Amino acid sequence: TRPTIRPRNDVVHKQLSAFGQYVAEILPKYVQQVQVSCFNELEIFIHPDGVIPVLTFLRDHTNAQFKSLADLTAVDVPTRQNRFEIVYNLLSLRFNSRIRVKTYTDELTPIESSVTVYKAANWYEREIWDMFGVFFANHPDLRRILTDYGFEGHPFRKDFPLSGYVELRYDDEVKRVVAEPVELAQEFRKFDLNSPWEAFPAYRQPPE
Amino acid sequence: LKKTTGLVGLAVCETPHERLKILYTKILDVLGQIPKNAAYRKYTEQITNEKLGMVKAEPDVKKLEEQLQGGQIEEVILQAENELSLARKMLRWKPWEPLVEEPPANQWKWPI
Amino acid sequence: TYKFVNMREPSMDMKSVTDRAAQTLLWTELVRGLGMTLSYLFREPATINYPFEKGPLSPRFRGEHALRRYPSGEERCIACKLCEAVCPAQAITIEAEPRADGSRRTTRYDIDMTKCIYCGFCQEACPVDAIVEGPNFEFSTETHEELLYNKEKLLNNGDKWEAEIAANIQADYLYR
Amino acid sequence: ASATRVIQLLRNWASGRDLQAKLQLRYQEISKRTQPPPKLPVGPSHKLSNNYYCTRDGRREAMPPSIVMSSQKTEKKAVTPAPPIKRWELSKDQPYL
Amino acid sequence: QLIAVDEKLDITTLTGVPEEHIKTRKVRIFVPARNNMQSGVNNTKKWKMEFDTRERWENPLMGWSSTADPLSNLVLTFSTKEDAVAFAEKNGWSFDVEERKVPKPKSKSYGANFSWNKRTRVSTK
Amino acid sequence: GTSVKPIFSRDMNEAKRRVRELYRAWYREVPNTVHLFQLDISVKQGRDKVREMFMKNAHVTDPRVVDLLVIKGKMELEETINVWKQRTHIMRFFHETEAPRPTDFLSKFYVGHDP
Amino acid sequence: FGREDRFLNYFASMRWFGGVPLISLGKETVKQPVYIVDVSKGIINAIKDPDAKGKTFAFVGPNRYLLFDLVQYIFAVAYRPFLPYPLPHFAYRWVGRLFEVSPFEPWTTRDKVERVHMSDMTLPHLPGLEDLGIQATPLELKAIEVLRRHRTYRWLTSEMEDVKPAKTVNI
Amino acid sequence: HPAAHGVLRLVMELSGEMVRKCDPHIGLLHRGTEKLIEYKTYLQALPYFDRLDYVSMMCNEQAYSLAVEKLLNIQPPPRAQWIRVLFGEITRLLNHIMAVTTHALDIGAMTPFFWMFEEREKMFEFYERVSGARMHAAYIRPGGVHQDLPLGLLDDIYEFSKNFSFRIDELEEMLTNNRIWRNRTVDIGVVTAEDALNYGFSGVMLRGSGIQWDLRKTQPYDVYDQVEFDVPIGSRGDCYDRYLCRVEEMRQSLRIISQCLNKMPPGEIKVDDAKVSPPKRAEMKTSMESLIHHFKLYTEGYQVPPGATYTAIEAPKGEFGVYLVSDGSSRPYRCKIKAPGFAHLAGLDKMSKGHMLADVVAIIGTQDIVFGEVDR
Amino acid sequence: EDNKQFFGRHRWVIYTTEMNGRDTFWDVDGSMVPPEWHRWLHCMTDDP
């Protein structure tokens, strides 16, 4: 148990649990769940309507002071009615701590832009819109950031194919670069790797 | 007396005790309009009362800085202004009300 | 623990003020920079005489791929497809069947060298040291099709570079 | 280096430092390109007995995260995520550049 | 406030998928069968969605396997059959559903190996 | 009720008004696009292509979907006006290098297995 | 006619000299030019057509033009001043002979002058482009893609529907 | 463009040579890395992190390995961590040479680039001797390091380190006190501490404005708590202060390299857990369990318990992070990469107000941007 | 070899003027070095 196993810090775990209870007490209108992982990371699950109040409180409160937006991204889980999960990663320099704020949305429901709260969010929101198709309300300038001009679809969605639908080549007759349906000399070969024997009993699901 | 706080764009404040007293009094005034049982009001009142009491009890700004544990009294003033702005916003938002719209049945279930 | 990089204050006496005035009017620091370039002018350059001189490499260097044999001449590869499974670029394509004498051998062993990232995972995964990255790195071609290797090309590379590949393996297998 | 001594003096005067002491080109102080074979130590779990894998299984000791305040389900001092960071000290080695 | 739509969910015009790969595709919603070479059952817990198999041909150079349909590798995972059906319907694909197959419970008896009058008695161990 | 929130429009009438405004902007822009990008097409061809692109999804009855389609159209118009787009991007709307794909049963039977 | 053609391009080259020398002022020559892509597609279709084994095809454009009108239209699309003057056949032939001595690709030849001032034959007994599924492309829709290179900077952005197509002597 | 630092379409709005608006267009090097990672095992996805920030390879490997180790609840051996910190400091030196010399080249000083790229070549030789590859070694792995050091590497690292300070001094003599350099860098691209904090800046882009933050000091990860060094801090928030900070960081990383060379401990190089780390070749060819584990780790890969982590290191260009999500299988469900250059470049229009073309060229250089990590 | 030169210039090869079929008086390249001398020349070993 000593040499090869990562050590666990109990003191940090206690502090993060207490701060999660604190935040949940102060904002009962939006907090749906508070969690602390066993490797010492704190998560806060909120209702989409509380994006702005929660982030503002965590930025401006004296006991919080998470003044930096470390990262903002999305995760797609097609089995859920609300397809998309929005994740905010915040870092506090005053208290040397990190926090994670989560919410959810689907294809047709916009999320409020967090640009007023954080200047850094402007590019991240653009990337979320480009890759997933999530619309952010009141964005200063929302448009594609990573994909080619006129690109159709959102490539980070699970349903989108890995190689896409079109390719590019140069055509001498029209003397320009043209787009055509993807054709592959060698098809990507799909592997089935998962073991039919369960690996982790601590995560077993009830048999429904 | 001090020059160059060391952070770009943060000017040195003369008479910082008066500024801190004014800001803490304004924070308490704003908090007075929030319902008494709201957690935000009581927690913020407790912390700002501690800070105001420590400000009133120390004339030396360096020992006040080391007592507040707030990092260079100018940023303490900036934090007080941030807290006052947050207090006004919170008064407008009223986040002490009960939770709205519980999530779907398996919204947060992982894995899958 | 921290330090300041630009937090000093110049002297205000007549001596140092005249020193700074002379620096401004007579260009002393510019002369110092000129002197440093002049100093570099008279050093021996670091250039080597390629291709007559080569850059230094090590036995762990990853180059062009090759297929190896046992000392009897029998191939080492047994078509386990571990290299195909582990390849992060999907650059290896393998087919196999029982040989006429019942041996487990490949009928197709292709490496797309324009897909390969030259990570060396295939030679770590191989359990019999059949596939290796050899020391050769000068194999540029004039067409794209010359970089799509089949089994004959890889076996020829192995027969061509074995004398160096075996010595390179002897020098590193105790670290593996 | 093979430079004549007047060239060495010219270089040292132009740069202001003794160039010969720390040459950029490496002449011969480097390791030999052929080395003796390594021995290499085995590691902690190589013991023959009292080495059951269930006693050194890091992956199986991971568990799902702890749930505090699930919504479905006084003294009350104010709290912070962690104690306030402590001021950095100023470089007993060299505080100013 | 709210607007109270009363239509059916249809996001096909927003996904950028070409018209051919919406109307002519048939997805399969099923729980994969257990690989008969192994006794483990951990791969028969979720629902899967996959598209119909299209043409593959041999590359004139190198004899590799070529494809022209982009959805030849797409496989989705769902917790329940209803979730997969909802996803397929909102994406505009026509689907077939196969009901989950479960091994029925069996009555095992070690003592039956040595029965006095029954045919269950075993000649060897 | 179905308890849904809008993006911009409350019903289909406001959505149609937004569609008409976007159509007006694109129709106005087409001649400038032909001039600036040095296209060999006529203004009539460009306006016909704009109309065809609008008609491609004339069957939508969800105001939220129409709202997002109008937002995407405005994004494309902003790309065209600022010249972020190149001649190849503008000409991809016409599919000039793609051979026609027949739609009757007999031709599909002759060429291959695809339905 | 096409981007790399020696037809439309050849006429454009004449502007440097000043005037455009034409035999009989180009009023007794009729041309039926065909687009390059139409010819290439027709060849590809003749490969895939099992009925075209021993056939003989004539690939011509949809319109017939007088040479004068064709050159006037070419100069109008390139926005260059058109200065046509009649040159006798012998004089033109003499000019053609002089150019031919070039060890490189000649600017013009006697044979080129002969073929330029010869009317295009009408062969209605032969199958054409339309019998291979090709609808021939008119010159008025593809001239700009060849002649925009011959314009000055002042006229480079002019659009295709600005230069008022020429008169065709059809039927 | 020579000063575009790769593939950047910076659409600029100018009145005369004054800059009114900067509109950075990116995605010219977006290769879809994250989806590709979703299609690989955890070992197979590791070489992508080499090619994210191709000037600091082993640092990206270290960040990804730390995230995977955290999700696996395992610990690397001490020698592996000392090797990791040693090569991370070597990588920081490589990155800072690249950044400073190419910034000077944009501004117009070409010679220091040539002087310092020879040192870069020698450090590439160290990379190749440890892994066989000059720049995309893939040496640092989630369980530790792939191979142990060859028998004579520490001596040559010491020989390089005992001389690198004179090269730094020559560069400093060329640039630091030059009045043309100061005219081109002082008071250019000033940013306040609060604006830097809000815009999401990190690393030198915070330290140049006086913010006393460094992840190696506040949140150490491998053995950084066992080394001693100083953190350079600026006071004006302009290009000149950031240049001074980067030079002093090179000096401090030389200090750390000396400490790492003196304190290298013995022992194994990867965790002694064959269900995560591959066994040795002799064991794989001798014992049944080793062969089975080698087979399974190179075909299917190890399963990572379900969960999500955000792991961040102090990369040479700022804070580099991975939000890695595990669904319990051998392949990551989602891997969001956080690059500091993304925020730094998103803040370029703010830093260019009231400046000219050459000032903006200088400002791009000061931000230390590589578009492999910006576009991903 | 000349060990007084710095690392990289201490070994070199003078290529032959005629390899298998081509005149290599002027046209030479690093691929004309056989594998054993390739290992010695790139300093992957100390023994020729």
Ligand SMILES: COC1=C(OC)C(=O)C(CC=C(C)C)=C(C)C1=O
């Ligand atoms: C390290 O940052 C980079 C540059 O700045 C130094 C570049 O110029 C370029 C490309 C331009 C030159 C010619 C190499 C690239 C690709 C790059 O990554």
Ligand code: SF4
């Ligand atoms: S070196 Fe890496 S990428 Fe190349 S074939 Fe081997 S495993 Fe594949």
Ligand code: SF4
């Ligand atoms: S080369 Fe090695 S790993 Fe690849 S199939 Fe052959 S024996 Fe297996």
